[PDB]
Each structure stands twice: as structure tokens, then as C-alpha cells.
Design a protein around this ligand. Structure first.
Ligand SMILES: NC(=[NH2+])c1ccc2[nH]c(-c3ccccc3[O-])nc2c1
Lengths: 110, 247
């Protein structure tokens, strides 16, 4: 019952499930990274994205994803859900988005 | 909370107490270091001077000298809260943010599309009365109650069609465990591992009920999932607001 949008606890890369493959894909970095990071954190139930960065597959790895998804930046601002403005793409720059969402719902005691 | 038990420090770190002129009136849940989600009915006309409200956090005993108390900058309540019972929700912006420590943490929201699981047992907490004709609790109390279906709750023997679609009931047909006066505005949280880590999410906000812990009169909660977008908007929109505003 995993949620289709996940964020890594090792390096905050965003992963979005691709149901035709049963795999998670990375989100190709774009000029709308801030809004995509914000929207992804909201989607998952976090309040906001505190920050986001760009990772490079060549230095960070794939970490078990299969491909990329790219965001239709023109439709981006008409959405509530990430999955409806995303498409598979090549992401030639091999650079993807990482998002640090505000942590929540966990106790911090020993 | 009727039929609950005393809880300890750090267990429900998102729980806060909203006090007006010195008295605890409502509970609330931290969404961040400076935003609290509570019920709109906690701000009737007689309680709208923001300078007279304080948010108490980080302690389970109401008289702990170790809790932090901050002021309120603004309150945004739902314009669809016709009494001003649906849309019984409001956001409180603190004048300065609370530090997040092992005793002060925000709770999560339901994810998009995440629905309530009927029958699931969640937790409700607060400092409200432990008996309807009883006194408020000195130490924060916690109780576990299951979600009830609206089909059951709106039946003539429960609340006969008074449960509207953006609210739900939780409790036992038998009564015995329930939220009560002084718990309004606080959290109804359910734990899940859909983000691959167990996290507690705010599924409901304590809103109302007939008496407390009676059989067939379960507590009613505001269904938070239905207000996700209202919350995201309000925060963006009013981050720099001061006063009572509506969205
Ligand atoms: N039985 C319940 N589940 C319940 C929960 C919260 C309540 N809050 C109140 C309440 C009563 C008077 C004024 C404000 C209140 O929130 N009654 C309540 C009853």
C-alpha cells in the first residue's frame, strides 16, 4: 500500500511510481524545481518543502529507479496532483530533484 | 477524554493547549513550529482578542513550568462554518515559532487521495473533562477509538442524519471511551507506513458530540483530508496576516 510518491531518507531524491513498469522513476530537474518540490511534499502529507537540490546520476547513482519522469511545466500550475503532469522522458542532463520536506509524525525519544 | 489514561512526555509531541485569559479551552495540533490546526468553534465572539490567547506546548501537565507559551498572531477560520457544524476548522499562526525538540514536533496530514479506513483504531488526546460532570484532566490523556461508518452514525439510533460528509464519528456503540468538553480542536491521529516509515497523521479534529461516552452518541470529528487544499492555501495566503480572518 505504498504511496506513489516517495522521498529517500538517504539523500531526499524524489521517486514516483510508474505503474506500467512497477518501478519508481526519478524527476528530471527543470526550471520549476521549487514548485515541483513544494507540490511533492504537499502530496505526500508533509506541509512544505524546506529546500530542494539537484543530484547527478553520475555522482549519486540511480538508487534503484528505472528512468525519469519530466514535468509539463506549462500544466504544472494547474495541478493539485503531481502524477497528472508527468511523462517519461530521457532527461539528457541526468540531473534529478531532491526535496527536503518538513519532517512530521514521528516521536524523537530514545 | 473519558475512559483514557495518563500519557507521558514526547508521546504526542504535536498536542498543544489553547488558553484564553488563563483557562484551557481547546486542544490543537502543530502543523509546523508556527501553525496550529484546531476547530473554528473555539473562537466565538467572546473569545476573539488575540492578545488574550496563549498556546502551551511541550508538557503533558497543565501546570508544568517547563512548557512553552507563545502568543497568537492570527486565526484563520473557515468561512463555511455557518455558526459564525460543518467546516469546524481553523488555523492559528503563532507570533513566533516554537523550537522543535523531542517534546514539540508537528504531525503529518493525510496524503492526497488517502482515505479514512472504517474500523481502524486511532488515538485521540486532550486535557478535557474525564467525565461530562467532571473536571479537566491535570495530565494529558490518551484513548484509542475506532472509526465508525457514516451509514451507522447517521442512523436514527445514533445521530439520525446529522453527520455531514466532511465529518466522521469514532467511538464504541457501547460508549465508555470518548472525547469530551475541553478536548475540542485537538487531534484524532492514525499511524501508517505508506511513506515506508511509520508516521502519525491528523485524520480528524475533535469537534462535538452529545454528552460524552454515552452509548450510541460517539464523538464527531472534522475530516481533515477534505480540507487539505484549504490548509495549504490559507498558510500561503495569510502567513503575514494578523487578526481573525476567514478563508
Ligand atoms: N462528546 C464529545 N465527543 C465531545 C468532544 C468535544 C467537545 N467539545 C465540547 C464542547 C462543549 C461546550 C463548549 C465547547 C466545546 O468544545 N463538547 C464536546 C463533546
Amino acid at each position: 500500500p505504498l504511496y506513489p510518491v516517495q522521498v529517500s531518507s538517504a539523500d531526499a531524491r524524489l521517486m514516483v511510481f510508474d505503474k506500467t513498469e512497477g518501478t519508481w522513476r526519478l524527476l528530471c530537474s527543470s526550471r520549476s524545481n521549487a514548485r515541483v518540490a513544494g507540490l511533492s511534499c504537499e502530496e505526500m502529507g508533509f506541509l512544505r518543502a524546506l529546500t530542494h537540490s539537484e543530484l547527478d546520476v553520475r555522482t549519486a547513482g540511480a538508487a534503484g529507479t528505472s528512468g525519469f519522469f519530466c514535468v509539463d511545466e506549462g500544466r504544472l500550475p494547474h495541478t493539485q496532483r503531481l502524477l497528472e503532469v508527468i511523462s517519461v522522458c530521457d532527461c539528457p542532463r541526468g540531473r534529478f530533484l531532491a526535496a527536503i520536506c518538513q519532517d512530521c509524525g514521528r516521536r524523537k525519544l530514545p | 477524554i473519558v475512559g483514557g489514561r495518563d500519557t507521558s512526555l514526547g508521546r504526542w509531541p504535536w498536542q498543544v493547549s489553547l488558553r484564553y485569559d488563563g483557562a484551557h479551552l481547546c486542544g490543537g495540533s502543530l502543523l509546523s513550529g508556527d501553525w496550529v490546526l484546531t476547530a473554528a468553534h473555539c473562537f466565538p465572539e467572546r473569545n476573539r482578542v488575540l492578545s488574550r490567547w496563549r498556546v502551551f506546548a511541550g508538557a503533558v501537565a497543565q501546570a508544568s513550568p517547563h512548557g512553552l507559551q507563545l502568543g497568537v498572531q492570527a486565526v484563520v477560520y473557515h468561512g463555511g462554518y455557518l455558526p459564525f457544524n460543518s467546516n469546524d476548522i481553523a488555523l492559528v499562526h503563532l507570533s513566533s515559532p516554537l523550537p522543535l525538540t523531542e517534546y514539540i514536533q508537528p504531525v503529518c496530514l493525510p496524503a492526497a487521495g488517502q482515505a479514512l479506513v472504517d474500523g481502524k483504531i486511532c488515538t485521540v488526546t486532550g486535557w478535557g473533562n474525564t467525565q461530562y460532570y467532571g473536571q479537566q484532566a491535570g495530565v494529558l490523556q490518551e484513548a484509542r477509538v475506532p472509526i465508525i461508518s457514516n451509514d451507522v452514525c447517521n442512523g436514527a439510533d445514533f445521530y439520525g442524519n446529522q453527520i455531514k460528509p466532511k465529518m466522521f464519528c469514532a467511538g464504541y456503540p457501547e460508549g465508555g471511551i470518548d472525547a469530551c468538553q475541553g478536548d475540542s480542536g485537538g487531534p484524532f491521529v492514525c499511524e501508517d507506513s505508506i511513506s515506508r516509515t511509520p508516521r502519525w497523521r491528523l485524520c480528524g479534529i475533535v469537534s462535538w458530540g452529545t454528552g460524552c461516552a454515552l452509548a450510541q452518541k460517539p464523538g464527531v470529528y472534522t475530516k481533515v483530508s477534505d480540507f487539505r487544499e484549504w490548509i495549504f492555501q490559507a498558510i500561503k495566503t495569510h502567513s503575514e496576516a494578523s487578526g481573525m480572518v476567514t478563508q
